[PDB]
Paper text:
CBASS operons encode cyclic dinucleotide synthases (CD-NTases) and effector proteins (Caps), such as bacterial STING, which senses cyclic dinucleotides like 3′3′-c-di-GMP to trigger defense. Here, we resolve cryo-EM structures of Epilithonimonas lactis TIR-STING (ElSTING) bound to 3′3′-c-di-GMP, revealing two oligomeric states: spiral-shaped single filaments and fiber bundles composed of straight protofibrils. The overall structure of the ElSTING dimer closely resembles that of the SfSTING dimer, comprising an N-terminal TIR domain and a C-terminal STING domain, connected by a linker. Functional assays confirmed that 3′3′-c-di-GMP is the sole CDN capable of activating ElSTING-mediated NAD+ degradation, cleaving NAD+ into ADP-ribose (ADPr) and nicotinamide (NAM) as observed in SfSTING homologs.
Residue numbers in the entry:
A (entry chain D), E (entry chain E): 1 to 227, 231 to 241, 245 to 312
B (entry chain C): 1 to 228, 231 to 241, 245 to 312
C (entry chain B), D (entry chain H): 1 to 227, 231 to 240, 244 to 312
Write the structure that this text describes.
Amino acid sequence: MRTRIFIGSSKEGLKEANYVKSRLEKANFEVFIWNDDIFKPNKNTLETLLNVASLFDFGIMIATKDDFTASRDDIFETVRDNVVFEFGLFLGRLGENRAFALQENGAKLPSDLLGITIPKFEKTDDYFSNYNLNTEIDNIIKIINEKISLGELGLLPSTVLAIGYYENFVSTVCDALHSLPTIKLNGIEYKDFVFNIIIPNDLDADIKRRAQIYFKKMDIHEVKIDTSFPLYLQIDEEDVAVLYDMPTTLGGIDKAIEMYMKKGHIGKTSQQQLLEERELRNFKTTLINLINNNSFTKTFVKVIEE
Amino acid sequence: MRTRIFIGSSKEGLKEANYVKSRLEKANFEVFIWNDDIFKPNKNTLETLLNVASLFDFGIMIATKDDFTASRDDIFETVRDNVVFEFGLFLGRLGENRAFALQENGAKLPSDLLGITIPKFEKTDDYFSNYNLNTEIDNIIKIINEKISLGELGLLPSTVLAIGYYENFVSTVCDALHSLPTIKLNGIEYKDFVFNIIIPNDLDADIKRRAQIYFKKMDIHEVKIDTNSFPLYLQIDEEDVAVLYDMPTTLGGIDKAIEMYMKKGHIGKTSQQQLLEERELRNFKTTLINLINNNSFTKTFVKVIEE
Amino acid sequence: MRTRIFIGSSKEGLKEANYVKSRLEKANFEVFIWNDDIFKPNKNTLETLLNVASLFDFGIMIATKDDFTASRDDIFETVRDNVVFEFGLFLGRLGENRAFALQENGAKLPSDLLGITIPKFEKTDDYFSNYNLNTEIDNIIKIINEKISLGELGLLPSTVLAIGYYENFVSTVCDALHSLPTIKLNGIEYKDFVFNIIIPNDLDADIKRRAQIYFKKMDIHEVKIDTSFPLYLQIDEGDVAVLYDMPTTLGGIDKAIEMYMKKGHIGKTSQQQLLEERELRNFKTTLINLINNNSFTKTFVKVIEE
Amino acid sequence: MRTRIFIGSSKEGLKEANYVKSRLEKANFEVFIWNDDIFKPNKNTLETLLNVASLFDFGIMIATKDDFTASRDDIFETVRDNVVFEFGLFLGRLGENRAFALQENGAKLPSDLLGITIPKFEKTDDYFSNYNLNTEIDNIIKIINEKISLGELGLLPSTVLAIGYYENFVSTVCDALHSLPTIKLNGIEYKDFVFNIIIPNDLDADIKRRAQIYFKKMDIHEVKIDTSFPLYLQIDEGDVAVLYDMPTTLGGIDKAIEMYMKKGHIGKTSQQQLLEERELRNFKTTLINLINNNSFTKTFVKVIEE
Amino acid sequence: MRTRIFIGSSKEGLKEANYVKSRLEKANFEVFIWNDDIFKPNKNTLETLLNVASLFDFGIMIATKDDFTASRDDIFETVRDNVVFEFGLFLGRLGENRAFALQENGAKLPSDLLGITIPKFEKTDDYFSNYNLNTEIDNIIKIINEKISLGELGLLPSTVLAIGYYENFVSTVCDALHSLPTIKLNGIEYKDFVFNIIIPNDLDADIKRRAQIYFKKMDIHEVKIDTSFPLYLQIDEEDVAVLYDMPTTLGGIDKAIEMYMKKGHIGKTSQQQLLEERELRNFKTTLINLINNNSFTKTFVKVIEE
Ligand SMILES: Nc1nc2c(ncn2[C@@H]2O[C@@H]3COP(=O)(O)O[C@H]4[C@@H](O)[C@H](n5cnc6c(=O)[nH]c(N)nc65)O[C@@H]4COP(=O)(O)O[C@H]3[C@H]2O)c(=O)[nH]1
């Protein structure tokens, strides 16, 4: 599991990037250099980099001098432009504050560009005692670690569903419950409520049917929550008021990942499952982060995995 | 049994095709190179190619270099275009997601086309120790094994029967049964139901009569299932588990389809006709079990078994 | 749990070793060429060939033209010396009717060498279209098939222990039981009897204690059958008598494995388990073959697994 | 708290040592090069090597070209002299099947050192693109992983104490208790019995006092069973009997640990605790391995933590 | 018998090694040089060294000048390195305070290295009139004679087993006996006791059986002693209270010896007997040194040999 990190080179930036690969791998980061195992069918790294978004999460770049003077290329000509095309495409397919890079001293790229620092580091044939790259890597580990728990992906189709679900259902039900004296559900009068959100492991095809069977199987009866339209939710019967729900909105991301890749294959494919897991984990992270923002939701709304 | 795989080389790469034959056969894949024994009565490989669809399931080829300059041929002239003619006709008769290829480093064939990646390998006269071709064969096996369990054959006459059967009968009765409180079947009230589908080994001649004589001897009583839209006639066994049974009545469709697929001029059943029956039935089983494992109303309550 | 074949070849004739490995593996024959990961510990092929007698069952060698004409050699001063040395040491550690060979049609090694007619083949590029070599491999395969249940001819101590066990306990017990109606057996008549033999699933240090524990688990008494000295075995309390006994002589073969495998290693190794299981399989095969060969014990003794 | 490995190199080959520790820690082996903060109290690498006979488990070292050709050296008159003397000290204090060696393509070290296959590598700049070095480190890793759970070779007194304890107490008591139905046990019958062995988490001087205190914590009475002399153990009052005992023989190993270190210092250090607990874990592993090798105790005794 | 010392010179200190051999013999220290008769099967001195620990007790190294300049070697190269590897591995197999050395005037070794003073001596072809090396052999003697009774060998299994024996058994029985007014042993009351320990001449196979067979034929009956766990011992009846015991802990060192040497060699060997005697004498020395230091053990616990 863990976060996927991608470092890019044309034909010579291999080992001075593999050092960062190994150090990040020491921190349980599945960092895949551009030629480990995924990109073997892909003849070039450009067709891989055009698929880095929402597939290889964060990324780093390393460039040196040995591929900066003169060389002929196969797919392109004047390969000296291929490195900067790679850098620009990688920075465009990830977004700012999510795509990092470094370069060698004397690399024909500016030290700073687009508000992202691109330090130039030394040669130091063996790098383990080069305590200038080391601080940068120690920093990047903790900066990325801050950006798994923080889902600043508002453009992504998962996060928009997450924020819509949170703000328009969880916030609404919690605000409605703090209106009448304590709680008015199914005749009996409760005192406190802890909302439960159950995110499925795999979405498959349709979500409403799964929610229906899941609620039927666990002996859960409907409730009325009045707020514009009153909300229908689910409560467990065994005054604690353990409210339960499954996000119905996940059908949107289900269809999105179905259409995202050319799918002429009945049933679930491993790539489809991996994309499913990525989108759902980002949805879960965004939902938790929004939950941890509002004071009325600090502790009264919990999300669990089943 | 197992999957059937085809490999195609013109007249000089047959050795590196035999190597892939051996490696696939080590993974329980039945592999028939285009000159094993079946195609000997066939005068050329092109009739075998026009008889490869729905018969050899998946397909592969190996592209070479030593037959790429000039040579005279019997059926054709300028045989040097037959490598790409093979690669085109073979991706035609089998379709995408059912045809693969491997090619030499720098071979005179397209690097990629039609969404089918064609990985490259070098000659390596020490073939068994080339950890580039072996990786390609390993991942081709891993790709294939993901396509036995998932039947992407919507054009096939069996997969459409599977989709129709599921969507119009199994999903329909599953939706109908989750309408009334627990169960209302023949007056008596059970709690939960287990739909069971029985796919025969062979379809014989007619399916309705086979169902009638199967359920006359196993002593199962009929039931009325009323959906929102015509009621679905099913049968529930009497011995509170509600084990509903049914056999796909529509398998006679695929029986007739593969009777008309091949020229059947002989009365009675035939070995090749049996092979086509088994192929279509296993594809139907795969498609139905995949559609069952999709919808949550069907994953558990509906099970397909072999009688 | 299948037969193992060791294929030995020079560093330049490894292609034929690989091809024969594939051909034998097509018959469910676990084949280990001298260059697998198991032999990375050992330094040279001579060390791995020295202990091939019991570790690797049968074997086969391939001698090629490129390692038989000119090379400087490392262990010896001449590869021409080397190849005949490995052939000799292999044919010595395995002996007659337990080792074969192959070589090029033009090799100076003669066809018949103290037995086992050594066939010929040609360097025909890719070998999947050689009828001669394939026919050779096929009759080799049928040879191992016909000599896997025959047993041994004075080989590893499993067979001699099996012969001793049968001819000194089983036959004498059965003769004693048939010499008169099986009436007494501690005062209760039984008519027919069954003598069940239970092979311990692994050689576990001292073996009589294991038999005592296993028999005590089933609440099994001791009977007193008379034959020179009376023989004592177990009964399992009268239409058909049932009698049990566990091979106690396997302690000797376990201790023999202990000596053969030099061990300052305090514990069990995968190598020790492999040798133990192979030698128990040999003992079991010898015993079953020899009990179905005879007439008194054709049907009245059953060998099973615990 | 895992396996530990010590890697030593000259002041210039520290690059190779760093790469090897990277490779080993990628395969879950805690590796300490001589340059760490642990060896600051020691003066020279020879004095760090002074106590590596048992402190740092397995060890491997590296020699290069120009730390083995010409230099002045500080401790000796020649760096070649220093490297060969240091390798001699390591190979002596570690021995066979517990040490390994790597050396540069031009190194003058012999390919054989009274055994132990010496691999061979080169200065290929950054070491993440070295196939042969990676494979040899991988075989080392597999050897270490398949070797750490076996036992010892007459090494630190943990293994000899384990063998003595088992073969003089556990086997004797188990054999005496299975020699007859466990009926008496001070006048009350139990049939089956369980012989629970508790390993103390840490060694604190005298251990029989610790045993008495711990047994009194559970209100345990003493029993007497006859076997030479009657062996007295503790019971835990009856379908299945249960017996307890913690190794009293650990007093000898604790005193050995105290004597092997300085006397003037009072109070335990982190180093003492680490070495002590490591060797205690070794004793526990040896005991459980020997138990699963034996017959009576395979399923009838339990070794657990206090 | 007496102390055994191994001395090492490569090819030019042979006369210088024989002189130190003679001067150690003058103090009755049996000296085996590396090529008397034992090491004839060993092709090189390196495989002689790989068994020098615990077999040849002490050690002395002799350094010569004509073996320091230049000479091609067989097992190594640049015998300048081979002698130093010798001096390092010999120190690694014996350690500090158990390994001494002598070096020629101007020899390329430190004057003081690793806590071993390496004294200087010139050639002096007539060695018997050299009052420099005679004085140094004298101080070697007065160092060694202090180190037979003092067994500071806490690493060696014999010493740790002895420490365990004393501290866990003899101290406990002495403390229990000096508790009630005079004596309460088998009902009868005595006044003073002489506990006695019978060190076996040979490790046999299991000291349990030897203990029973020895105590049965002296008509010695068991005694009950109460201290955690009670103590069972042996007392003779013919008020002197001669209690008896036999060290049962010697089983561990036994199995350690027969596992230390690879044993496919059934039966005892001269090497086995030599290790036997060395381990037994070390155990007896350690126990008798621990006994006289204490006050409760100096007088009432005597060690005897049958
Ligand atoms: N609760 C209990 N445990 C037992 C008994 N006998 C042996 N053990 C356990 O087995 C350890 C080693 O026993 P050993 O090899 O026979 O060698 C033993 C033995 O030769 C002797 N020894 C120890 N305890 C006794 C004893 O209670 N009676 C006698 N006669 N000798 C003893 O000292 C050696 C080391 O003893 P330890 O350090 O104590 O460690 C002992 C102890 O943990 C017993 O009667 N009761």
